[PDB]
Design a protein around this nucleic acid. Sequence first.
RNA 1: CCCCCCCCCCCCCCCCCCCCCCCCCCCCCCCCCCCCCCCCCCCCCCCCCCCCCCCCCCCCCCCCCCCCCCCCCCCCCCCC
Length: 204
Amino acid sequence: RLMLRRVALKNVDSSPSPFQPLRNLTILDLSNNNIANINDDMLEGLEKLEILDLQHNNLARLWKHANPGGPIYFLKGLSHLHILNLESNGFDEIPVEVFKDLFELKIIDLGLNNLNTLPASVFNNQVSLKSLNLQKNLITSVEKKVFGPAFRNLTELDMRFNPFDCTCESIAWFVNWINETHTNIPELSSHYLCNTPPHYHGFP
RNA sequence: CCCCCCCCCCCCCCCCCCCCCCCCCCCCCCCCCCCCCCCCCCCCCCCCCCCCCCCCCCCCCCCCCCCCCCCCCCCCCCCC
């Protein structure tokens, strides 16, 4: 376990990964450090890593398609990763094959970001997901082609402050899944308020 | 056994002049190549300064909400 929360890491983007000798590393916290550039091969050889926290950082550019050199898939080879946190990273786009190898992911956190559109068929490999947290984002539509495999068998859901769109093309499957479910959705009728169109403005 | 004087023709040598043909050097013009310097055309790379745009982090301010601690008051009831 190596905790580096709010330590302002510098020279973190070296060509050889400093966590390469850490073969038995299981918990790694890199939160509140304003890390900007992260290499692709930083977590190579980290088969036994389970807990990864990268919340409150600046990795928005690393996932956009306009980033030179291509998006950074720094989550490859993490077969045993269990809890992942990416809060307040300012993410605006998620690459399609970033979560391709997380076969044992159960807890994922993506709140307080600028997510608006997610690629279709991204959460196929998370067959053992438990909690999905997307509070305080800019998402507007929830559909099967992206959130179908995500909502297979969960236990928690955190999507409070989002401007949901009330349209049969964008929310009908979502509200249908709300009607019958066993996942714990707290304050479902308090902050899951429809922002757009103004006809359904504020309607749960 | 004799010298002299005239003339024709053909020689040889030497000085001058005029012809071709060639060599060397030089002059003028032009062309080609090499080197040096300079000007212009663009397309740029690197560095610095200035100005903005996005995202994020620390600190601070304002408005709150919850919890904890302390103080006061109102009503009800007992002890001596």
